């Protein structure tokens, strides 16, 4: 029954592809040709953060657009005050190898994780006066690549065991598991309504899950290599994926398509971090060429280059109010651009 | 122009920077290593020996100091077979200790392939490899005794002969050392096929219970630090 099952699975895949082609009436470039280009955007390094020891591997902006948490391979989780460059907290880590960090929307907790298989949630608003490990989650069998906060009690995490997990922090157990990916899940982005989230893995596929149901609704495959970053459009009906080849592709949820791709013949290295502006007109992508590129998310034209890092940009985030974009590379430095 | 709260916050930031610099001194002084190998190869034995003599957890860190210098050996466990993604975390380590079991010739070939993945990696182009040809008493016994001809797996063994090299000082059967060096020949050929900056392989013929492994690691790390000094200090 294996052969007939494979044949009918291929038939279903062909039907899905045919429906996708039949829904592709026009290209986003043709529709966007009528509107004016955004022009050159010359962002400058307003602030630099130079307190870390080793390569910075992740960062996350707060809801207040004031504090940002940064994770480095030395075992340090530093919370920076962007306006004044001061350091609020310097949390040591039990495991030095950290690949992701998340800042809770309420600001009370901060998440970290990496090769230690454990998502460590730290409490910053303790009445006891010090930052302590609020809880350690140890249900994964692979390196944690991205953890994101839904609320103060629920977290969503992606690991290298080709699975994602929704945890209840108080109980400490996996409330829900997502086991559709066939490769290492490296990125994770939550929708603004916190009901769906897209996970990008190394199988050149980005999968849209449902938090409250547990199954997978859409699977977008348009890349020919790994996927390292993924980020929702502010609308929530689209997202952008950065890949190990120099292509950033924008997918739409409603049509289940590949709206348009951003690639240049002069860029060869892969993309590490992808984020959008508040409007969604600008897409900032960090590269291994030691610099970041801003693309016009509707015209697929490179609107500018950050070009302020001496090593590969690993993390890149945009504040909720759209005030600034913070980029961190494998140098000890984290730079804020405006 | 700063207020009382702002000045106190700046003072707290300076205090944080003090501990950050204190930790930076140790981190720069500390020497970081990565231990890689298959389940067949003797890897838990080596870490157990160096811990005695000096769950689903992922990373295991082993402090061990020799000649008053510390080594932070990192073992990656509870991870999938595909290592091409988390290995990017180890561009700053001093060396990669690759342990290969020389007794089992059936799985030896794929081990070489794994070595290639470590050597021909776009991220470990500067990272040197300290290769450990482990489980040699088993090799010794395997080759001295009959019925496990090397030629059954590698056709080039018949056409290979021992060179004018350093035979071990104690008594060693010439065919045993011939096979023992032939195994090293493939690894060094892979190492020298594509060489980059500070990218050299240090092969050591070792045993799991041998107590000199820490000394070999210390010597190889001394050579690697020598090379990175010659590069960092303006000499090359």
């Amino acid at each position: 029954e294996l052969d007939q099952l494979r044949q009918e699975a291929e038939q279903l895949k062909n039907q899905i592809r045919d429906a996708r082609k039949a829904c592709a009436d026009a290209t986003l470039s043709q529709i966007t040709n009528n509107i004016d280009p955004v022009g050159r955007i010359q962002m400058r390094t307003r602030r630099t953060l130079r307190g870390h020891l080793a390569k910075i591997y992740a960062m996350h902006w707060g809801t207040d657009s004031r504090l940002l948490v940064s994770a480095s391979q030395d075992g340090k989780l530093i919370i920076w005050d962007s306006y004044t460059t001061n350091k609020v907290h310097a949390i040591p880590l039990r495991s030095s190898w950290v690949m992701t960090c998340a800042y809770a929307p309420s600001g009370n907790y901060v998440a970290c994780g990496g090769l230690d298989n454990i998502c460590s949630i730290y409490n910053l608003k303790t009445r006891e006066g010090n930052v302590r490990v609020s809880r350690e989650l140890a249900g994964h069998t692979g390196y944690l690549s991205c953890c994101r906060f839904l609320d103060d009690n629920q977290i969503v995490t992606s690991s290298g065991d080709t699975t994602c997990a929704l945890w209840d922090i108080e109980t400490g157990q996996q409330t829900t598991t997502f086991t559709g990916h066939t490769g290492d899940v490296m990125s994770l982005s939550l929708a603004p309504d916190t009901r769906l989230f897209v996970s990008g893995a190394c199988d050149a596929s980005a999968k849209l899950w449902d938090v409250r149901e547990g199954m997978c609704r859409q699977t977008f495959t348009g890349h020919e290599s790994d996927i390292n970053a993924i980020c929702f459009f502010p609308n929530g009906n689209a997202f952008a994926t950065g890949s190990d080849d120099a292509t950033c592709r924008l997918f739409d949820l409603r049509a289940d398509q590949e709206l348009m791709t951003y690639s240049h013949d002069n860029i060869i290295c892969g993309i590490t971090s992808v984020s959008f502006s508040k409007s969604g007109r600008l897409l900032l992508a960090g590269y291994d060429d030691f610099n970041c590129n801003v693309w016009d998310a509707l015209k697929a034209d490179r609107a500018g280059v950050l070009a302020g890092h001496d090593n590969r940009v690993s993390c890149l985030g945009v504040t909720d109010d759209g005030m600034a974009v913070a980029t961190g590379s494998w140098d000890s430095f984290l730079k804020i651009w405006n | 122009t700063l207020s009382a709260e702002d000045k106190a916050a700046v003072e707290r930031s300076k205090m944080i920077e003090k501990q950050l610099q204190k930790d930076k001194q140790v981190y720069r002084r500390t020497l970081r290593l990565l231990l890689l190998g298959a389940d067949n190869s003797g890897k838990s034995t080596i870490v157990k020996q160096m811990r005695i003599y000096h769950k689903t957890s992922g990373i295991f860190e082993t402090k061990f100091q020799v000649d008053k210098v510390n080594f932070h050996m990192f073992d990656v466990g509870a991870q999938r077979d595909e290592r091409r993604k988390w290995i990017q975390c180890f561009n700053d380590v001093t060396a990669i200790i690759f342990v290969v079991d020389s007794s089992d010739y059936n799985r030896l070939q794929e081990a070489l392939n794994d070595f290639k993945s470590i050597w021909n990696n776009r991220w470990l182009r500067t990272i040197s490899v300290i290769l450990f040809l482990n489980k040699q008493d088993l090799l010794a016994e395997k080759v001295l005794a009959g019925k496990s001809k090397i030629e059954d797996y590698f056709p080039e063994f018949a056409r290979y002969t021992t060179p004018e090299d350093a035979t071990p000082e104690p008594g060693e059967d010439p065919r045993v050392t011939r096979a023992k060096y032939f195994i090293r020949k493939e690894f060094v050929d892979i190492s020298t096929a594509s060489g980059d900056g500070r990218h050299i392989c240090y092969p050591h013929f070792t045993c799991s219970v041998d107590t000199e492994n820490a000394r070999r690691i210390f010597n190889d790390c001394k050579d690697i630090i020598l090379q990175m000094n010659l590069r960092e200090y303006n000499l090359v």
Partner: single-chain antibody
């Protein structure tokens, strides 16, 4: 968190003493500390402040020079050398805990305090006593001689409630932020040189004396203190 002071008693004038405050539970090394003295028939008054790391030691203008003060982080104990005792120092001395960062809440915990008996910016409260009935909202307002709106964007006034026979407890910090562990009914508002605190649906166990502070620049002068009774 516990923060208990000791070293009180009858003192002959012109003598010396050591007030020792012991901390238990919280990170003393990461927290700054303050001393506040309250006369039997008067309000609060700032005495001294020690920053984390002992890199910033500030004293009150009215008493500068005649106190020594230090901290012992390994012993988690803060020492205050009382020197040149005067009759104006006849007051209960309270220990205050404060950490300073973005979003922090300084002046959280106040110790029980020890009585000691021997043989600038000014803020004033319009009313020193308001007769109120439980269940009715009450407004306590105080004014300052200087505007507390710093250029950063937040006003540094703090509100404290002292119940009869109890240590003062923080209610509102920075004129708009509600302290931890206090009922949501309290609120604070106002603008330059005029701040007010509103207690909606007044309940039991909230009567006492209310003070409003300043933190733009040392010294941190207190208010007269509005007394609220049933």
């Amino acid at each position: 968190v516990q923060l208990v002071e000791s070293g009180g008693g009858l003192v002959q004038p012109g003598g010396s003493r050591k007030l020792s405050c012991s901390a238990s539970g919280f990170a003393f090394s990461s927290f700054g500390m303050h001393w506040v003295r309250q006369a039997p028939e008067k309000g609060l008054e700032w005495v001294a402040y020690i920053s984390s790391g002992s890199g910033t030691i500030y004293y009150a203008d009215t008493v500068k020079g005649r106190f020594t003060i230090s901290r012992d982080d390994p012993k988690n104990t803060l020492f205050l050398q009382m020197t040149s005792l005067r009759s104006e120092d006849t007051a209960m001395y309270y220990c205050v805990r404060s950490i300073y960062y973005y979003g922090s809440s300084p002046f959280d915990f106040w110790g029980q305090g020890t009585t000691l008996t021997v043989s600038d910016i000014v803020m004033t409260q319009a009313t020193s006593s308001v007769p109120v009935t439980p269940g009715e909202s009450v407004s306590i307002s105080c004014r300052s001689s200087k505007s507390l709106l710093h250029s950063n964007g937040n006003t540094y006034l703090y509100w404290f409630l002292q119940r009869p026979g109890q240590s003062p407890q923080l209610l509102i910090y920075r004129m708009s932020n509600l302290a931890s562990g206090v009922p949501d009914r309290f609120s604070g508002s106002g603008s330059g040189t005029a701040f007010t605190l509103t207690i909606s649906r007044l309940e039991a166990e909230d009567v006492g004396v209310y003070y409003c502070m300043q933190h733009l620049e040392y010294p941190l002068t207190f208010g007269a203190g509005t007394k609220l009774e049933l």
